[PDB]
Structure 1
Amino acid sequence: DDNHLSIVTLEEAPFVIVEDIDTETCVRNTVPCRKFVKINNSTNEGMNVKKCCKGFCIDILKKLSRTVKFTYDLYLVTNGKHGKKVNNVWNGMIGEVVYQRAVMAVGSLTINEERSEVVDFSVPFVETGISVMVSRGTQVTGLSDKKFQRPHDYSPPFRFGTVPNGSTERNIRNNYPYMHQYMTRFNQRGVEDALVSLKTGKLDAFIYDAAVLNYKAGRDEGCKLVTIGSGYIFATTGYGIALQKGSPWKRQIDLALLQFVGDGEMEELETLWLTGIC
């Protein structure tokens, strides 16, 4: 009915963590979420499978459901991740919302201009942007540091990279063309490989999503890996809930999220799921 909402999310620890069902039911702090699971890699055939979801974003969804008073059917997106426009068709979580298969999307979904043209976003509930991680001792400010913009002006020249084909690289390509060209030979397969490169001295700085880097710094064995101060984050933005354009839920979601922030409940979820021992 009008009060029961189709909601899409995406597996991405610690924001959304997916587990197998028990007892046939989802217990503890988990909620039901289903996934359309493909038969094989060469077909559109598949089967809906019952799962259990928990995490930072799931706790947010639970709070919203209680406060704003809606019920939901939660599913995991299967085509894409967060959302990219391919052949002028949106995939991922963004696509589910744009094409009306979900009323909202909840997850580590970054707010930007391109997506905002096709969905409405709640207020940000987690701050992010483009940040920089280094091993303690290494001296840089944020992305706009001349040491990044003109590495050859310094000795030795800085070695720094990102993960290819994501939003950080895309932003750098648009804003700092020489820096982008310079970084290509230092780019990293993924976040894990980047952390090793830093720790083993093969890389001086790793440039990436701020929330991800803060999470990683929080749990670095030895607590030697650190991020720049939040004052230096470039292109500051946030993760937010995506709703359909003109959605009748947006005001209520927004007010609830700001109440949560105001009452310190947001700081509590961050301490629970995001803040590490470092």
Structure 2
Amino acid sequence: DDNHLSIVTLEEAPFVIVEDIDPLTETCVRNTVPCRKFVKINNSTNEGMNVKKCCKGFCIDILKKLSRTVKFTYDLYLVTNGKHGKKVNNVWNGMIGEVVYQRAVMAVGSLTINEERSEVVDFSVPFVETGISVMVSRGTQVTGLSDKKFQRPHDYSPPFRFGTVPNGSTERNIRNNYPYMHQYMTRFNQRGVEDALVSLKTGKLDAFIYDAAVLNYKAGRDEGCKLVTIGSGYIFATTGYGIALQKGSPWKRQIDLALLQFVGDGEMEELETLWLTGIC
């Protein structure tokens, strides 16, 4: 009861991957766990229906392990109000919002720990290292975020074409640290990671700035190993993915010790080889 938790997540392979459930059996099998998604009936009503789906991935494997050792059950659902989390007119949306407004006890996914989020939710210890990296075609001369080509884009002709997926931790960091770069980049906003990789591969974009762990995963699976992260996998603003909990959550301590036990006992290494290993 107090042991059965509402938990929110968000699709982002390979950390969280969503699949359609078997029409029959309507049962999740294999490495997957049940996760529901609220889907609107139409755009003229507030009516919707939870659709039963199945979730798997690195972070889902983490959740299963935490459920086993911290001893809780859960009702996993996919966020529909935004994505990871952004403060809009001083109100948090996304996974962060679900936790802040007490719709979820915790958020599990590719959720980046940062200062402004930590003001409104508590984060577990980081369990996946990440930060901001830059993906380019192999050989592209860029030192890092601080490269003049990004910092002062119009000092070059033609200027470097580079973008991120807006509204997440990466854009927030850039907007705060590099105001001119940021207002320049918005014209190259990408709707999502898949769009961005297509833009890079066909030469519509010179660089894609995004979450380090996801880019390292994409670099590992790239056809031809032609897209790479710069600086031999350099990372600005090193941080990690964390489990977000409500401020003052009584679950935080056990969750932290659990994650640290998984790391210390080498259980994280196998999840990494399992989900995050790539050919390139």
Q: TM-score, normalised by structure 1?
A: 0.90
Taking the aligned partners of 1:218 and 1:150, their CA distance within structure 2 comes to 30
Deviates more, 1:98-107 or 1:4-13: 4-13
Superposed CA deviations along residues 77-126 of structure 1, whole A, max 9, x for unmatched, are 22222222233332222122112221111111111111111110001111
Taking the aligned partners of 1:58 and 1:87, their CA distance within structure 2 comes to 32
**Deviation (angstroms), 1:251:** 0.9
Q: Is the 8 A contact 1:143 1:233 kept in 2?
A: no
**Deviation (angstroms), 1:182:** 3.8
Distance change in 2, residues 1:9/1:197 (3 Å): closer
Distance change in 2, residues 1:53/1:181 (3 Å): closer
Distance change in 2, residues 1:225/1:3 (3 Å): same
**Deviation (angstroms), 1:198:** 2.8
Deviates more, 1:85-94 or 1:182-191: 182-191
Distance change in 2, residues 1:49/1:277 (3 Å): same
Q: Is the 8 A contact 1:141 1:232 kept in 2?
A: no
Distance change in 2, residues 1:45/1:181 (3 Å): closer
Backbone CA RMSD of aligned residues: 2.2
Distance change in 2, residues 1:154/1:65 (3 Å): same
Taking the aligned partners of 2:253 and 2:275, their CA distance within structure 1 comes to 26
Q: Is the 8 A contact 2:135 2:227 kept in 1?
A: yes
Aligned pair count reads 278
Distance change in 2, residues 1:16/1:190 (3 Å): closer
Q: Is the 8 A contact 2:126 2:240 kept in 1?
A: yes
Distance change in 2, residues 1:256/1:164 (3 Å): closer
Distance change in 2, residues 1:122/1:159 (3 Å): same
Taking the aligned partners of 1:185 and 1:80, their CA distance within structure 2 comes to 21
Distance change in 2, residues 1:5/1:136 (3 Å): same
Gap regions ≥5 residues in structure 1: none
Select the residue among 106, 109, 112 that pairs with 1:110.
112
**Deviation (angstroms), 1:214:** 0.9
Gap regions ≥5 residues in structure 2: none
Q: Is the 8 A contact 2:216 2:233 kept in 1?
A: no
Deviates more, 1:46-55 or 1:125-134: 46-55
Distance change in 2, residues 1:103/1:238 (3 Å): same
Distance change in 2, residues 1:11/1:42 (3 Å): farther
**Deviation (angstroms), 1:180:** 2.6
Distance change in 2, residues 1:3/1:181 (3 Å): closer
